[PDB]
Design a protein around this ligand. Structure first.
Ligand code: SF4
Ligand code: O
Length: 753
């Protein structure tokens, strides 16, 4: 038995490939078929491999993740619910990463120093909560959670859960990394089996090879166009084929990462020599050697069946740019000029933003600087404003030394801190007035409405960072780097050649500024105090328990039309300063959702006063008057970010049930965790039989059972009524979260009482 540590920070915690193999063998003895790669790693992590019922797309798997990671905008509510379980330390290796509260304003350390003084209370809280419960802490400036995870923590066959959507990024290193809400991470840190609905598996076969301007990003921008934002729901995306071996480890992380934008449970690549070179370049040669020895369990079984198969010829794939308000509106960079002209999107690119998490590696920085260096050899600088986020302090230190940062700086770039920044709206913008219509190209992944700067006329197009650079040098959406014009002030030769770059540093990486903090061995006398008067941090008052009765005469707060992401339910940006305080953050509840009645964001009819106004105020009026309510939603309600606040905030403001045509995975788990009832129309046309005025009775809660539909009476103002049926995906574990008022109350009644 090998004793290879999980990371450089937990030398006493070994990789368990013998347990994985042990459990894969038990499960294929029961299933008697080839297993996909994701099936190998997921079923190899089952708590009961001998007795787990296993069926893709319908069974709930009780899993034992190897580690947990949180970022600081979702770590706050996850550790208040861990505090509340009153466990003295966490059960598996866990980390907090301080990357979401650093606002981009001046660049680099002006901004970082600013964020340390502005978010001192929260960073203190998380640092002393981590020292006490045994959670590793990555300080402000360390880097974006996924980038530190890929560098330090992801390895082949790991099962990692993270309180973030883009945790799937770690699949570029052959692990299964799945985003969850804080209350799931609390389960695994507390020692509870993590339950996951058995994924269906999409195979993406890659043939050929990536060439010239076409980069990793374009493979997932293509797949997202192909499959749409809803197409990966309840499935893990598995890349296979001849062309996989043409992709660097960090470009495999890029493809796995944006898979979140099709709603996939996660995405993964098979262990290969590009993962082995990346493990060795990051000081984890021993993990690559161990994985080689278990490679059979870290690739798919020959002949495994994918439920859906898509083919992408890498060699004929050419550059993409997606948007403007959904990540699945895919355009080749060549036709994006002509189609923006046609559709009424600005061709002027105000700001080009490279980096942030999907695309912030040393290869992304080398390819961006290779474009920028050419512009510079012709005495050119950017016509658009340009920002660069390094993915981690290691990448910042290594590209500084290898000179990429000075080239990016010299074409007019501002290197921002190693933090999300612009990506979740931690950006103090300035170049446009409020409501100005503008374009911005970014190498991020999401381009939801007003996500970046809190302005809706902002058309955000996502693409590769080398395309963001060249298009920032050009200033317009009608420049296609592959064919077109350059001048310089020398007057000469027009064309930007294909940005060649170094995959990894040819010397060793430079680590930089010292950013990690170990939990002390004996943490006796770590008080983690939360001020009772703090406006940033507040303890969670347990939600009420279910009174045993049905839900009669529910008022509709809002019937939502169309696309309703977690950014519509609970916006980020200025709202991240309250992510530790549920009553203050509940003031953004569904302010961005579109009301079907008037098609306005944030004005719904108050049913008592008949005055239209803000959705949070109306919810608070109903709660204070004892009027219970529901949201009626359309398709894939709760798409996007994993923030469990989307679920905590309707519960806190008096909500009882959300009834939709369908839900995104993670938000539906969170609504069940907080004691709400996520329900779906058995017939989605029934959405049209429910009008804003109608009162709803959900009946037969007293017989709430797995697989049994609930009925709903739609009581029309005029005395007619009609009964429809509502489906749910609750199992008995989850029904007992409902009955107890939340999964936290259910844990608390199990701890004696
Ligand atoms: S998507 Fe943006 S806010 Fe979410 S983790 Fe990545 S960089 Fe940070
Ligand atoms: O994210």
């Amino acid at each position: 038995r090998a004793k290879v540590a999980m990371s450089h920070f937990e030398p006493h915690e070994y990789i368990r490939y013998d347990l994985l193999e042990k459990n894969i063998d038990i499960v294929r003895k029961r299933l008697n078929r080839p297993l996909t790669l994701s099936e190998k790693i997921v079923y190899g992590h089952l708590d009961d491999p001998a007795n787990q019922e296993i069926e893709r797309g319908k069974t709930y798997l009780r899993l034992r993740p190897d580690r947990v990671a949180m970022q600081d905008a979702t770590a706050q509510m996850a550790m208040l619910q861990f505090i509340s379980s009153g466990l003295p330390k966490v059960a598996v290796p866990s980390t907090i990463h301080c990357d979401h509260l650093i606002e981009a304003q001046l660049g680099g350390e002006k901004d970082l120093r600013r964020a340390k003084d502005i978010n001192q209370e929260v960073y203190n809280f998380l640092a002393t909560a981590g020292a006490k419960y045994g959670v590793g802490f990555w300080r402000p400036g360390s880097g974006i959670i996924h980038q530190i995870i890929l560098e330090n923590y992801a390895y082949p066959g790991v099962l990692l859960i993270g309180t973030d959507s883009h945790t799937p990024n770690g699949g570029g290193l052959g692990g299964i990394c799945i985003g969850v809400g804080g209350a799931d991470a609390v389960d695994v840190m507390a020692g509870i089996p993590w339950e996951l609905k058995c994924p269906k598996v999409i195979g993406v076969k890659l043939t050929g090879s990536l060439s010239g301007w076409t980069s990793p990003k374009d493979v997932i921008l293509k797949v997202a166009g192909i499959l749409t934002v809803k197409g990966g729901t309840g499935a893990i995306v598995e890349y296979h084929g001849p062309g996989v071996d043409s992709i660097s480890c960090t470009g495999m992380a890029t493809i796995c990462n944006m898979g979140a934008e099709i709603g996939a449970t996660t995405s993964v690549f098979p262990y290969n020599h590009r993962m082995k070179k990346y493990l060795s370049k990051t000081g984890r040669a021993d993990i690559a050697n161990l994985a080689d020895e278990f490679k059979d369990h870290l690739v798919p079984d020959p002949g495994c069946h994918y439920d859906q198969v898509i083919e992408i010829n890498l060699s004929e794939l050419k550059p993409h740019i997606n948007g403007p308000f959904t990540p699945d509106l895919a355009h080749p960079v060549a036709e994006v000029g002509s189609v923006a002209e046609k559709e009424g999107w600005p061709l002027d690119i105000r700001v080009g933003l490279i980096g942030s998490c999907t695309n912030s590696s040393y290869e992304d920085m080398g390819r961006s600087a290779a474009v920028a260096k050419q512009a510079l050899a012709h005495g050119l600088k950017c016509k658009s404003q340009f920002t660069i986020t390094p993915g981690s302090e290691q990448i910042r230190a290594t590209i500084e030394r290898d000179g990429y940062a000075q080239v990016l700086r010299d074409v007019g770039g501002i290197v921002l801190a190693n933090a999300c920044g612009p990506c979740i709206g931690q950006w103090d913008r300035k170049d446009i007035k409020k409501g100005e219509k503008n374009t911005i190209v970014t190498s991020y992944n999401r381009n939801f409405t007003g996500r970046n700067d809190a302005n809706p006329e902002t058309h955000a197009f996502v693409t590769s960072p080398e395309i963001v650079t060249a298009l920032a040098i050009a200033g317009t959406l009608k420049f296609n780097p592959e064919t077109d014009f350059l001048t310089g002030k020398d007057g000469k030769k027009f064309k930007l050649e294909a940005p060649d770059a170094d995959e990894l540093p040819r010397a060793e990486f430079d680590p930089g500024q010292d950013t990690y903090q170990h939990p002390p061995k004996d943490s006796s006398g770590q008080r983690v105090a939360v001020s009772p008067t703090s406006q940033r941090l507040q303890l969670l008052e347990p939600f009420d328990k279910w009174d045993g009765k049905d839900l009669e005469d529910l008022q509709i707060l809002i019937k939502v039309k169309g696309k309703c992401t977690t950014d519509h339910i609970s916006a980020a940006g200025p709202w991240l300063k309250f992510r530790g305080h549920l009553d203050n953050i509940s003031n953004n509840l569904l302010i961005g959702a579109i009301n079907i009645e008037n098609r306005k964001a944030n004005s719904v009819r108050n049913a008592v006063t008949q005055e239209f106004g803000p959705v949070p105020d109306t919810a608070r009026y109903y709660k204070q008057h004892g009027i219970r309510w529901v949201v009626i939603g359309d398709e894939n309600y709760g798409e996007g970010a994993s923030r469990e606040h989307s679920a905590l905030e309707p519960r806190h403001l008096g909500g009882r049930a959300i009834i939709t045509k369908s839900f995104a995975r993670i938000h539906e788990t969170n609504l069940k965790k907080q004691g709400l009832l996520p329900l779906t129309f058995a017939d989605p046309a029934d959405y049209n039989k429910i009008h804003p005025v109608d009162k709803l009775t959900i009946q037969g809660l007293k017989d709430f059972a797995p697989g049994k539909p609930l009925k709903c009476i739609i009581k029309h103002p005029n005395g007619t009524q009609e009964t429809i049926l509502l489906n749910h995906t609750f199992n008995e574990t989850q029904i007992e979260w409902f009955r107890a008022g939340s999964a936290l109350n259910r844990m608390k009644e199990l701890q004696q009482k």
